[PDB]
Design a protein around this motif. Sequence first.
Motif, PDB file in Angstrom:
ATOM      1  N   UNK A  38       0.859  -1.191   0.000  1.00 26.13           N
ATOM      2  CA  UNK A  38       0.000   0.000   0.000  1.00 26.13           C
ATOM      3  C   UNK A  38       0.900   1.248   0.000  1.00 26.13           C
ATOM      4  N   UNK A  39       0.696   2.090  -1.014  1.00 26.14           N
ATOM      5  CA  UNK A  39       1.494   3.291  -1.224  1.00 26.14           C
ATOM      6  C   UNK A  39       0.949   4.482  -0.452  1.00 26.14           C
ATOM      7  N   UNK A  82       0.674   6.612  -6.562  1.00 26.27           N
ATOM      8  CA  UNK A  82       1.443   7.149  -5.440  1.00 26.27           C
ATOM      9  C   UNK A  82       0.625   8.000  -4.474  1.00 26.27           C
ATOM     10  N   UNK A 215      16.543  11.653   1.989  1.00 28.62           N
ATOM     11  CA  UNK A 215      15.292  11.866   1.246  1.00 28.62           C
ATOM     12  C   UNK A 215      14.220  12.338   2.203  1.00 28.62           C
ATOM     13  N   UNK A 217      10.332  12.459   2.721  1.00 23.75           N
ATOM     14  CA  UNK A 217       9.296  11.555   2.214  1.00 23.75           C
ATOM     15  C   UNK A 217       7.870  12.091   2.261  1.00 23.75           C
ATOM     16  N   UNK A 265      12.611   3.862   8.093  1.00 20.70           N
ATOM     17  CA  UNK A 265      12.392   5.208   7.597  1.00 20.70           C
ATOM     18  C   UNK A 265      11.062   5.736   8.122  1.00 20.70           C
ATOM     19  N   UNK A 267       8.008   7.214   7.061  1.00 20.26           N
ATOM     20  CA  UNK A 267       7.222   7.326   5.818  1.00 20.26           C
ATOM     21  C   UNK A 267       6.084   8.327   5.862  1.00 20.26           C
ATOM     22  N   UNK A 283       8.932   1.932   8.793  1.00 16.45           N
ATOM     23  CA  UNK A 283       9.377   0.655   8.268  1.00 16.45           C
ATOM     24  C   UNK A 283       9.737  -0.389   9.324  1.00 16.45           C
ATOM     25  N   UNK A 309       4.073   1.937   5.606  1.00 15.87           N
ATOM     26  CA  UNK A 309       4.406   3.031   4.697  1.00 15.87           C
ATOM     27  C   UNK A 309       3.270   4.100   4.714  1.00 15.87           C
TER      28      UNK A 309
END
Lengths: 317, 1058
Positions: A38-39, A82, A215, A217, A265, A267, A283, A309
Amino acid sequence: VGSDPVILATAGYDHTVRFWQAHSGICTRTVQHQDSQVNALEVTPDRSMIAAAGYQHIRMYDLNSNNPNPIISYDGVNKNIASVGFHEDGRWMYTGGEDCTARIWDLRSRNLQCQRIFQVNAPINCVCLHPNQAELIVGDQSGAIHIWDLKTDHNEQLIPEPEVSITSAHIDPDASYMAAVNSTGNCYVWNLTGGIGDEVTQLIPKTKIPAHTRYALQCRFSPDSTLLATCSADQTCKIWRTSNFSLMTELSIKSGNPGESSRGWMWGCAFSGDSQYIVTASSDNLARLWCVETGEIKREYGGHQKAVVCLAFNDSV
Amino acid sequence: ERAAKCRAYAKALHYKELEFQKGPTPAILESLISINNKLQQPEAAAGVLEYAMKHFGELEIQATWYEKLHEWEDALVAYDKKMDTNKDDPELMLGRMRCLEALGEWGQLHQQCCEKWTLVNDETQAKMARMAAAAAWGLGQWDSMEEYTCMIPRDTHDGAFYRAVLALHQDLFSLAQQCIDKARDLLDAELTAMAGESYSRAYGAMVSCHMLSELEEVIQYKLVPERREIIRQIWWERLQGCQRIVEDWQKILMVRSLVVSPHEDMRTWLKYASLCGKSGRLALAHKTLVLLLGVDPSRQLDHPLPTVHPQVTYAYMKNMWKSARKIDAFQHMQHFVQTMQQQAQHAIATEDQQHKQELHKLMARCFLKLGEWQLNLQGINESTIPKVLQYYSAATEHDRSWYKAWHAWAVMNFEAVLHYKHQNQARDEKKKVTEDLSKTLLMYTVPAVQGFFRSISLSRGNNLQDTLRVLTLWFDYGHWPDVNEALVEGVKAIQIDTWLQVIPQLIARIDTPRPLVGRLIHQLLTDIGRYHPQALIYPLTVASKSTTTARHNAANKILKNMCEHSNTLVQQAMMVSEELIRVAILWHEMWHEGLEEASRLYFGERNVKGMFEVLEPLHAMMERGPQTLKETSFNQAYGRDLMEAQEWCRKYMKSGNVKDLTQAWDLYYHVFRRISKQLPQLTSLELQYVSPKLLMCRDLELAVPGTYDPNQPIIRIQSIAPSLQVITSKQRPRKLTLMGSNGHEFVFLLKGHEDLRQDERVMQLFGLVNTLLANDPTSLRKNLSIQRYAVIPLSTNSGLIGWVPHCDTLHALIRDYREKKKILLNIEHRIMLRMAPDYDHLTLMQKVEVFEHAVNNTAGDDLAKLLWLKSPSSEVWFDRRTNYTRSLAVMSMVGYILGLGDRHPSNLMLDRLSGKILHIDFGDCFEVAMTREKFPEKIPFRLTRMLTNAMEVTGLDGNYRITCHTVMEVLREHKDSVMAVLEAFVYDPLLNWRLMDTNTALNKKAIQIINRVRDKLTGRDFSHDDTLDVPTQVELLIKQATSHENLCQCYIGWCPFW
């Protein structure tokens, strides 16, 4: 599981979408989301259903009816979806694809295809809808931010830092500020011109915060418009104030030992209604409830076997 | 004793490097350039300083870093910036000065020393003297020198040296003779200390020892009146020979300046100024020439240049061009030539016929420059074409036997042809149009052909480009009478040797439908038959068995002709190649693939007419009957079923019933399953069962495949080894081994269903690239080369590949290590899937996390570590690594130009004795790998983590990047050669098949590919609009090769984490 005043939902790589009761840490229900990670998760404004943006699909599970599987699937797009976003009058849903399209979907109609398409050049990482419900801010991987005027179909574009993928963008409830966050780890902030009744909407640049080294996010504005939270691959959520753009509170999940690998991370985040609290997607398989003033870990939501995420958080009357 | 000296360092470095792995401090970084210097490895140490800059700006005045990098010109204008902001600082002043002495700026070094003398403290003053002495020497101020030499102690080798120079100005010989021998031992015992300057004064002691032997040659010159020519010769030979940088050579000539003035010695000083120009110290090159002219810094800038010394002026002009002032340079040239021809024609009294000749040579060079420059300023167009050709043909006249001259003339005509063609394709996007074009193209075509022919005979050995060009004109336009005439003429004139080089390209056109072109190809191949038939029999044999009819006809016509002089060689070649194709794929393996295919067409596709087309050659194959014991033992256990399977298939042909055709397939699957079970029960083949005719083969006159070259005695096939090891791939290559007539054995991979025609032309390209690297001095200095192997196609499916000895695939070496170290071989993969079961479907962002997770929980050191444990000592370890880094960077760059995709860990290997790298499998070429649908490549070459690790620490800054630049520089310079070779296969009629596979006219597609290559060879391969110089483009590529965002996207099999 929608009758409860607080909706807290978590998804990732373990093929579940889990619903938590915020004030206990107990998992209310789990929902089977097989064949993809799942984004993105977003609860519809009217709290009737939750959407799960995934690989070549958006699946929509019911909050009012407890226990069934998806009400609505949307198919036939290729590569990942996304971002999800909903219009307030609950009819329109917006998506950002790796397929370089912003897509507006009619939710109250039966077609498996979408009403409108805005094609850009790079894959789209995020879509968010200006509070005035007339503009879609679209951020792509080339580093462009497109303001899509849903009335004129005129597009206007803007590049803060060229050649660097913009990763999320958001816009405060009152519509005074727009934030965008990129893969450098910078956060760009723009002021907003209220020529809204006649359609203008100018952006006048205010700051570049060096939010992170890794990065970035996600970024999200408190409903208060007091604060701007920023989530990163640097294992951190940094809450910045909108008066100075100084850091107020840092939430981290670092090892506290320089030889531990990065343990996950950061997210995603969602603020609470009152702006007192923040929720955290990681994560390490846990969602987390933090106190925004203190940076204290108030609760931990621990059910997923694989990474998290996604969040969706909801307070509405 | 000296042998065992470097071993100590090599071992100490290994641990010192692994110490940098443990914690990169300035303490290690300092004690690492030092050990690298003593190990006579200068470019690897240069990289250590690059890291030192990019991490620790802590011994940083930005001008001390520019100083350490030997970048004196930047350091000077940085020490200016730092000084005028601050005060007088006696540290910055010496820093500022060291730049001026290594620039050879004596004019200012002497000035800036005398401009500040109260500010010289006894520390500052001691250093001050050494430099202000050479500054005075460089300005011939022997008074100033002696005053400063009286300040440098007699204990320093420097002091004792400057006494030797001053006595030699004043003609004191036995004084200077002593001073030399004392300056030696004060440097002999100096380098025992090793802590002052460990290599820039050790290589710079070779400067001093050279200078001190040359000063002893100077003492001979001023004392022996007969060693004039002899000393000057050793001075001249060890100048075209000797390679020592600009700075060192200022000093070397300063020694000789004691005895010979520049005017008597023009050829020396011009060659020197040539080198200052070549290396890019233009303002210094100028000053040399100015001195030689006896006039002119560009001061009387509006006036004509002086013809006074025609040789010097010519250099000045190209210096001016190499500066900025290039309209000016072009103008001065046009006029210089006008003067030269008049100073020839009219000033020639017949006595001066040497001076006529050398003068005529100069003019040819001027004429070439004029043509070259005109194009640079204006380009190719209607007004420039006849003007440059005029300059080029002029150059042709003046030096009739000059390769360059004839080449340039040929190329200009050829590009004139192209200019009009490309103009006409441009016309058609938007009768008399064609007729004028016919006359326009012909106008330039015939000369181009002639030019390329005269240039070919002026090369010989090195003329692939010119030869290929001749074929382009031939195949493109050689059916017009005029063009054909020129070709026939040329073909007669040129040596036959030439064409060997180009044999595959010719055979590729055996079947040309154009009649006039056909004739000459057959004519030529027949003559290349007559002399050296070996070079033709394998390729002609391939061609003579070809489904395309007109190919095989015309091949046989040549083999017929070849029999009338070489019969039993033709017969041998015929037979050996027949039997190899039989051995390549056995009867059952043919039946295996043909039943995968037929089951896909019928069951999976509903196509009986396709299915019938598959099975019919296989049934008709066996209709000829078994020819070997293995063919029978198959035919026994399966033949009965198959003949009857065909029976049911032909019952259907006349009925149409699916029930007639299901009884056939019932029979077909019986044999299919049966085959599949027996398949990994072929790990060996015996020649007595498989092809008896080959076992029988003794003492043939046929050469060992791809060993023939005309320079070297023919190695013939003496006998074939009776056993063939079968490597267990899905393709199943046999390991064929022949005994040569020379004694030595020759191993090959005999391959079935693997079109080797592609690898063949690729191997050709490496050949050329190899030549260019052997030819570029720096590339030769470093032994940069591509490991190549023999490629001998045998048909469309099959062919032989040279087995390179001592090599193991990357994969193999890693497999072996991981098992020996009890690490699960596929650990990263398993890590990745544990974390993310849907790994392949993740957003780029999500993928990077999982990739990084995998890398961070695994050792990147495997390849580095195994390469250490393998090596029998540490100095052998070190060289193997030097070799590795270098050879890998060579193929990075070449690979990139070629667009060589699919470099997974089974497709590159490492020679375990030299450490050099080898690429195999040249299937994916040009952008092909990247353009594909599922799992596209984002990588320009594998610069994977374990590869990087296996370099030195500071690897990418060190040898790797430096080699990258060097190789790329060679490529960009020789772009035309490389393009000729690539164009040859991109437009090859039989090989265009590789780029229509983008589906899962081609004229258009071909053009793209070549543009893409031209782009790469001009640094237009990133931004269309910028033109990137080498170090930039290389840097962009290393960046690209290394991007986690790229690597995570690679198909897992490619092993992005290795």
